[PDB]
């Protein structure tokens, strides 16, 4: 009834002794009968003789020695034979923070898509927390995000430092300084719109740290589900909001973007991958980012 | 790694549901996942889904399905195979004519073999005459042949009359008769290819007999080592050939087989043994023919 009852029988025959029988794979001494007897007197057979020195093969049991080593080798043949199959070939899984969709990300993916028309590219928008979990659980192969990951099991790389801008309605007093810029210090009175109210830590918290980081803690906040909502509420004159430079892909009537002069009013973009990562597909993706940056006149991240 | 992992997998696929899946023997309900994953995430495989109604099989996990009905049935026929034994020390040697490999003989032999997993079977290909000499000398135990043998020492039985047909090139006027059929008389003017050229008296002589018995003696004649040569040469347009019906196992582009209409244009198939032959084994060979013949619809030979 079991495959375990057949490896045990091989051990008694092929060793041709009792004084020497520990040579194969994980073997004891006491249950070298209880494992054999279940096989024997159940459906109705009795195999070897017990059992002088050395062992001689038996009429009924020797054929059982012929058919067992073949029936055993079949499962180890047909497993590995079942391995011989992969579906939709090689796949590359990529996690990312939605905020990046307004940046160079889609374009980067497009080129990696062309250079590798061979493989399947899956794209999941997930937070940094989730990306960490996904990378370590092998669910994704690479992640893009805004904030650092503390976790020795992941390697992170800064790709570029991105500039933070203030979103304001056109007729806002701050807009007078559109051509030079304001400092963070100027914003602390304004009703501020943070986003996205969703899996922490996200861009919301990042902004808050930037203020903390600068000795500012503004107590006129309103957290809001997402960016377009914030930009919308802002273009309706609810208040202001901090946004990454790339978000300038969204132009609403009477919505103005003002730079921040504070040298460190910056949001970063990292790539993270599994710690011991060698895959040519990842390196290629990497070199693709490098290729695209090269184009934009941006600095290049090193090997 | 165990037969247990195969007895639980069949109980889900053949049942098509998780609501009711217990048509087999001795199966629980809570451990319906721990006993399934042991086979998979150890050697590294992924199979079925989890799990809508009804559960559909996956491409990779469908290759596992067959084999799982082949190896579980190797264990189920293992119980009803080892009680058949009679201890390997007796060899049965069988003599046959090359011709007979295109018909029931191999199928015959396989089945016999399966009835007697204890016996060692040796198959020697030899002309009906060497067979006759070999049987008397005891160097073979049963002989299958086309030709008849005048010997008191031999005991011959007619297994069945096999039909003759005409190998023709597709573009031959006679191919027009593929469904009705031709008479030996239609063949005289044609070039006939005969086979084999070997120690006489062989299938060539048989064909020559069949013609003269019907009063016909054709002169446009050429012998040829083997049937492959006859047929293949016919495919090239070097003439026509007469073959056992069973030789339609070989098929070749623009080789076409035409049936003969002369009720006696037959080739017979005999078994030969020693006269005073009484071995259960030969009796057992013979009953195997009777089963194999019953299957295919052919008339059985007597007792």
Residues A114 and A234 in one domain: no
Name residues whose C-beta falls within 8 Å of residue A92's C-beta, 6 or more positions apart in sequence. A116, A119, A120, A121, A122, A141, A142, A281, A285
**Residues A159, A291: Cα–Cα separation, whole Å:** 12
From CA B191, how far away is CA B268, in angstroms rounded? 24
**Nearest beta carbon to residue A75 from set B71, B78, B83:** B71
Q: Residue A223 corresponds to which tokens in the numbers above? A: 């957290």
Cβ pair B45:A83 closer than 8 A: yes
Tell me how many domains chain B contains. 3
Distances (CA, A) of A57 to A9, A54, A69, B81: 12, 10, 15, 18
What the block records as the tokens of B179 is 């469904």
Distance (Å, rounded) from C-alpha B71 to C-alpha A74? 8
Q: What is the DSSP string of B19-80?
A: SS---SSS--STTSSHHHHHHHHHHT-----S--SSPPPPHHHHHHHHHHHHHHHHHHHHHT
Residues A285 and A277: beta-carbon distance below 8 Å: no
How many Cα atoms occupy the beta-carbon half-sphere of A157 within 13 Å? Answer: 16
CA distance B137 to A190: 116
Block residue for tokens 């290819």: B193
Using a 10 angstrom Cβ sphere, with 0-12 exposed, 13-18 middle and 19 or more buried, the burial of residue A251 is exposed
Cis peptide before B261 (omega within 30 of 0): no
In the numeric block, which tokens belong to residue B235?
């495919």
| B132 shares its domain with B185 | no
The span from the CA of A147 to the CA of A276, in Å, is 21
**Closest C-alpha to B256, from B233, B279, B235:** B235
Do A255 and A296 reside in the same domain of the chain? no
Q: Is B20 touching A (CB cutoff 8 A)?
A: no
Beta bridge mates, A160: A269
Instruction: State how far the Cα of B18 lies from the Cα of A28, in Å rounded to an integer.
Output: 39
Residues A152 and A273 in one domain: yes
Structure tokens belonging to residue A145: 């995000």
> Following DSSP, what letter does each residue of chain A receive, concatenated?
--SHHHHHHHHHHHTT-SSS---SSS--STTTTHHHHHHHHHHT---S----SS----HHHHHHHHHHHHHHHHHHHHTTTTTS--SSSSEEEEEE-GGGGGTTHHHHHHHHHHH-TTSEEEEEE--HHHHHHHHHTTS-SEEEESS----TTEEEEEEEEEEEEEEEETTSGGGGGTTT-B-GGGTTTS-EEE---SSSSSHHHHHHHHHHHTT-----EEE-S-HHHHHHHHHTTS-BEEEEGGGGG---TTEEEEEB-STT-EEEEEEEEESS---HHHHHHHHHHHHHHHHHT------
CA B178 to CA B181: how far, in whole Å? 6
Quick one: A145 and A279 in the same domain?
yes
* B7 and B153 assigned to the same domain: no
CB B198 within 8 A of CB B228: no
The set of residues, in sequence order, having a beta carbon less than 8 Å from that of B167 and lying 6+ positions away, is: B230, B231, B234, B240, B241, B242, B243, B247, B255, B256, B257, B258
Tell me which chain B residue has its CA closest to the CA of residue A47: B82
Q: In terms of domains, do A244 and A185 share one?
A: yes
Backbone angles phi, psi at A100, to 5 degrees: -75, -20
Under 8 Å CB-to-CB from B63, ≥6 apart: which residues? A82, A85
* Cβ <8 Å between A82 and B63: yes
DSSP B98: G
Give yes or no for a cis peptide into B51 (omega within 30° of 0): yes
Distance CA A189, CA B271 (A): 111
Q: E strand or H helix at B93, and its extent?
A: strand B91-96
Q: How far is CA A296 from CA A108, A164, B113, in A?
A: 12, 19, 77
Q: Is the domain of B92 the same as that of B145? A: yes
Known binding-site positions of B for cis,cis-muconate = 99, 128, 203
* Region for B138 from its dihedrals, namely left if φ exceeds 0, alpha if ψ lies in -120 to 50, beta otherwise: left
- Measured on CA atoms in the order A84, A86, A89, A95, is the torsion positive or negative? negative
Q: Which of B59, B87, B115 is the last residue of a domain?
A: B87
Q: The domain that contains B42 carries what CATH number?
A: 1.10.10.10
Task: Answer yes or no: do B59 and A2 touch at CB < 8 A.
Answer: no
B299 and B197 Cβ atoms separated by less than 8 Å: no
Q: Taking the C-alpha atoms of A202, A203, A207 and A212 in order, what is their torsion angle to the nearest 10 degrees?
A: 20
Name the β-bridge partners of B223: B194
Closest-CA distance of chain B to residue A70, Å: 10
- Both tokens of residue B186? 């239609």
Cβ pair B91, B124 in contact under 8 A? no
Asked if B83's CB is within 8 angstroms of A45's CB, the reply is yes
Rounded Cα distance, B4 and B160, in Å: 48
A70 and A192 both lie in a single domain: no
The sign of the CA dihedral B268, B270, B275, B276 is negative
Residue-by-residue DSSP string for B197-246: -SSSS-HHHHHHHHHHTTT-----EEE-S-HHHHHHHHHHTS-EEEEEGG
Cβ count near B215 (within 10 Å): 8
Please give the structure tokens belonging to residue A86: 């992969």
- Contacts (Cβ under 8 Å, ≥6 apart) of A298: A160
Residues of B with Cβ-Cβ distance to A82 under 8 angstroms: 45, 60, 63-64, 67
Q: For residue B195, give the DSSP letter.
A: -
If asked whether residues A168 and A222 sit together in one domain, one would say yes
- Among the partner-chain residues B60, B67, B78, the one whose CB lies closest to the CB of A71 is B78
Residue B297 region by backbone torsions, left for phi larger than 0, else alpha for psi between -120 and 50, else beta: left
Please give the helix or strand (H or E) that residue B13 lies within, else none.
Answer: helix B4-13
Strands A142-145 and A91-96: parallel
Is the minimum CB–CB distance between B69 and chain A shorter than 8 Å?
A: no
Does residue A8 have a cis peptide bond before it, meaning omega lies within 30 degrees of 0? no
Q: Examine the domain organization and report whether A218 and A251 are in the same domain.
A: yes
Distances (CA, A) of A69 to A13, A15, A39, A77: 11, 14, 16, 12
Q: Locate A283 and state its tokens.
A: 């390196």
Residue of A78, A84, A86 for testing the chain B interface, max B β-carbons within 10 Å: A78
For tokens 């009795």, the residue is: A46
Which of A166, A237, A82, A156 is closest to B42 using CA atoms?
A82
Neighbours of B16 (CB within 10 A): 14
CB B115 within 8 A of CB B77: no
CB A145 within 8 A of CB A273: no
Residue B273: CB atoms within 10 A of its CB come to 21
Characterize the bridge pairing of strands B192-194 and A91-96.
Answer: unpaired
* Separation between Cα atoms, residue A137 and residue A273, nearest integer Å: 12
Q: Which of A23, A58, A87 delimits the end of a domain?
A: A87
Print the domain residue range for B180: 162-268
Nearest C-alpha neighbor of A6 from the set A44, A56, A47, A55: A47
Cβ contact B82–A63 (<8 Å): yes
Q: What angle do CA A275, A276, A278 make, to 5 degrees?
A: 125
Pairwise CA distance, residues A30 & B69, whole Å: 34
Query: What is the distance in angstroms between the Cα of B24 and the nearest Cα belonging to chain A?
Result: 14
Q: What SS3 state is found at B126?
A: coil
Q: Would you say B79 and A47 are in contact if contact means Cβ atoms under 8 Å apart?
A: no
Question: Which helix (H) or strand (E) is B143 found in, with range?
Answer: strand B142-145
Quick check: B35 and B8 in contact, CB under 8 A?
yes
Dihedral through CA A130, CA A132, CA A134, CA A138, nearest 10? Answer: 180
CATH number of the domain that B192 lies in? Answer: 3.40.190.10
Directed axis angle between helix A34-43 and helix A4-14, to 10°? 110
For chain B, the maximum distance between any two Cα atoms, rounded to a whole number of angstroms, is 83
Nearest to A273 by CA among A237, A243, A242, A301: A301
Chain B positions touching A4 (Cβ under 8 A) are 2
B153 and B172 co-located in one domain: no
Query: How far apart are the C-alpha atoms of A107 and A115, rounded to whole Å?
Result: 13
Asked whether the beta carbons of B82 and A64 are under 8 A apart, the reply is yes
């Amino acid at each position: 009834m079991e495959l375990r009852h057949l490896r045990y029988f091989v051990a008694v025959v092929e060793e041709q002794s009792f004084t020497k029988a520990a040579d194969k794979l994980c073997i004891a001494q006491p249950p070298l009968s209880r494992q054999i007897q279940n096989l024997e007197e159940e459906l109705g057979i009795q195999l070897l003789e017990r059992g002088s020195r050395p062992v001689k093969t038996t009429p009924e049991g020797h054929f059982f020695y012929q058919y067992a080593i073949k029936l055993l080798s079949n499962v180890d043949q047909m497993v590995s034979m079942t391995k011989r199959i992969a579906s939709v070939e090689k796949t590359i899984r990529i996690g990312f923070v939605g905020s990046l969709l307004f940046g160079l990300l889609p374009r980067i993916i497009h080129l990696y898509r062309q250079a590798h028309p061979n493989l399947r590219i899956e794209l999941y928008e997930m937070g940094t927390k989730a990306q960490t979990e996904a990378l370590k659980e092998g669910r994704i192969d690479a992640g893009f995000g805004r904030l650092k990951i503390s976790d020795p099991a992941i390697k992170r790389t800064l790709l570029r430092n991105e500039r933070l801008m203030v979103a304001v309605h056109a007729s806002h007093p701050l807009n007078q300084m559109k051509d030079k810029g304001v400092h963070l210090n100027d914003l602390i009175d304004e009703k501020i719109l943070l986003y996205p109210s969703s899996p922490k830590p996200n861009f919301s918290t990042h902004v808050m740290n930037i203020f903390s980081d600068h000795g500012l803690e503004p107590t006129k906040i309103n957290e809001v589900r997402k960016v377009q909502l914030a930009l919308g509420l802002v273009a309706a004159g609810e208040g202001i909001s901090l946004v990454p430079a790339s978000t300038q892909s969204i132009q609403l009537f009477n919505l103005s973007y003002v730079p921040l002069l504070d040298p460190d009013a910056i949001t970063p973009i990292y790539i993270a991958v599994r710690n011991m990562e060698e895959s040519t597909y990842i390196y290629s993706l990497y070199e693709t980012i490098r290729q695209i940056y090269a184009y934009e006149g941006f600095t290049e991240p090193p090997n």
